[PDB]
Design a protein around this ligand. Structure first.
Ligand code: SX4
Ligand code: NI
Length: 560
């Protein structure tokens, strides 16, 4: 059998005590009252996950598959990519990346200490000399926060040692950063800020005489990825103009790490063996994106979809095409699904044809409509606020390595719920500790950034434009979704938030400087007598390079 996993019976074990119930402090009730709805996943559900993700993969590859692949390799052949030096790779490591098993940590790597650097050189040398020995990985259960829907089992994270991760950056950081946009062009989702994503989708939608669209949800995508898929990815990478040392490092990491390897729990026991995508390597995002695009492109051909345009972000897939009527479309999607299945990517929820752009969810998000200061209709990116709000409830009472609320304000700044609930609540908390100036870690497209909350108005103006501070008259469908979420979690109604916001705003203005700019721009929506919002001079000085270039989820990337 071609099983995604084989297991020894050893348990996936935790690294510390794990909390599953929402921690509660004196601030918790100001955000939500239904605490029993928020939970975190733990290793206790890791066995249930192992069950779901362990299956036999069969793959039948036809001429559409090979045709798309040759086209992809033709574009990949135009890419020239460079090896990073050790210092460069080290400086890309998150400060609290998991320490090495060889007696150094992420801080020693970042500081280029002799023990970290020497070992990295020794790992590199071993990669060039040995192209067969499977590389050990650690398997963990992720602790992630959700609202009961009741419970999702914990996801599994599979990752190699810190020295190897630095070596992966050296060989592949420039490749995974530049190749997907070259191969997939306008279809590569991670090149877009949220506004550009919205622009791409709307323009694509308008470019069809009779538009039809659908999202495609692969069942446990990482588990569907076969040895073939992973060797196909390597062959694409090798199309690049690369140093012969990078060629050798990439071959080696493919053979020894990417295709598969033994799994070790946190106690050092052998848990079994992986034959599918490792969720915590540098190539996780790029590999998944390339493989999802290959399979989907070939499936579009197989299904004879007319004038199909895709948007792919890792395992996340949206297709927009020419409609041929409701019946022909439902038929086409069934053929598309069959093709995908034959390629090892069967669906979770079966895909359905959609005739309203606003109702297509991709990357957990949708397009919606609001109005700017001049009353002009404006499209913007939004999402169901449930998960953002559950994580904020958790982050309200617990410090966490990644502040999802901050990532969410940045990505969803134009939304009704980010502005009325998240900015209000978190600025209120930060004021009360005078922690406005304290840099916080967050993630955007899987890479980690250290961000000062006082820089939000400028960050938002750079990413979303001044209109993100001006939007009004949101759509009934959006207002109803937000209101439904507030009922579910026991969040105070929007009117309470408006009230609180006038207070937060007044408090920030009182502080002058950057704090007062936050009060001015972020909360201008809260007062009847609205201030005049002008371009912020600090905004045009922001080094927002690399922000929306590529996706690095699982990839251990720090861009600060
Ligand atoms: N007109 C707006 C202006 C700013 C923001 Br943020 C949201 C809106 C907006 O469309 N709505 C509709 C539902 C909530 C909000 C209006 C509202 C209702 C009660 C209290 C405060 C507000 Cl801003
Ligand atoms: Ni076989």
């Amino acid at each position: 059998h071609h099983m995604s996993y084989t297991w020894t019976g050893a348990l996936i074990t935790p690294c510390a005590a794990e909390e599953s119930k929402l921690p509660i402090n004196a601030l918790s009730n100001s955000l939500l009252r239904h605490h029993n709805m928020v939970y975190a996943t733990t290793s206790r559900s890791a066995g249930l996950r192992q069950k779901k993700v362990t299956f036999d993969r069969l793959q039948v590859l036809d001429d559409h598959y090979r045709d798309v692949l040759k086209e992809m390799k033709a574009k990949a052949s135009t890419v020239k990519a460079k090896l990073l030096s050790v210092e460069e790779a080290c400086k890309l490591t998150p400060p609290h990346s998991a320490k090495s098993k060889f007696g150094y940590g992420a801080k020693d790597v970042r500081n280029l200490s002799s023990k970290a650097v020497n070992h990295i050189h020794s790992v590199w040398k071993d990669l060039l000399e040995d192209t067969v020995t499977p590389i050990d990985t650690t398997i963990m259960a992720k602790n992630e926060v959700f609202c009961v829907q009741g419970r999702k089992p914990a996801r599994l994270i599979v990752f190699p040692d810190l020295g190897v991760r630095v070596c992966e950056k050296m060989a592949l950081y420039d490749v995974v950063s530049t190749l997907p946009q070259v191969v997939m062009g306008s279809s590569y989702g991670f090149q877009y800020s949220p506004g550009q994503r919205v622009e791409f989708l709307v323009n694509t939608w308008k470019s069809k005489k009779n538009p039809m669209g659908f999202s495609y949800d692969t069942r446990c995508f990482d588990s569907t990825v076969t040895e073939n898929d992973i060797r196909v990815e390597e062959s694409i990478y090798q199309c690049c103009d690369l140093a012969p040392e990078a060629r050798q490092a990439i071959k080696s990491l493919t053979e020894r790490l990417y295709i598969g390897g033994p799994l070790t729990n946190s106690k050092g026991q052998n848990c079994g063996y992986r034959r599918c995508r490792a969720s915590g390597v540098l190539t996780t995002s790029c590999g998944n994106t390339l493989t999802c695009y290959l399979k989907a492109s070939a499936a579009c051909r197989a299904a004879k979809l007319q004038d199909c345009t895709m948007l792919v972000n890792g395992d996340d897939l949206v297709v927009i095409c020419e409609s041929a009527g409701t019946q022909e479309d439902a038929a086409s999607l069934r053929v598309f699904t069959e093709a995908m299945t034959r390629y090892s990517a069967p669906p979770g929820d079966p895909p359905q044809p959609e005739y309203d752009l606003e109702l297509i969810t991709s990357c957990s998000s949708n397009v919606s409509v609001a109005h700017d200061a001049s009353g002009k209709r404006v499209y913007y990116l939004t999402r169901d606020p449930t998960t953002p709000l559950a994580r904020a409830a958790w982050e309200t009472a617990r410090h966490t390595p990644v502040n999802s609320w901050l990532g969410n304000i940045i990505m969803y700044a134009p939304t009704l719920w980010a502005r009325m609930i998240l900015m209000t609540h978190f600025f209120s908390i930060l004021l009360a500790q005078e922690q406005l100036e304290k840099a916080l870690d967050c993630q955007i497209y899987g890479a980690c950034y250290s961000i000062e909350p006082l820089d939000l108005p400028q960050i938002i103006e750079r990413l979303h434009g001044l209109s993100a501070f001006s939007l009004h008259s949101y759509s009934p469908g959006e207002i109803n979704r937000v209101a439904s979420c507030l009922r579910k979690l026991g969040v105070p109604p929007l009117r309470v938030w408006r009230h609180r916001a006038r207070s937060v705003r007044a408090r920030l203005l009182s502080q002058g400087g950057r704090a007062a700019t936050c009060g001015k721009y972020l909360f201008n929506w809260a007062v009847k007598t609205k201030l005049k919002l002008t371009p912020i001079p600090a905004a045009s000085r922001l080094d927002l390079s690399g922000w929306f270039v590529a996706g690095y989820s699982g990839g251990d990337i720090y861009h600060s």
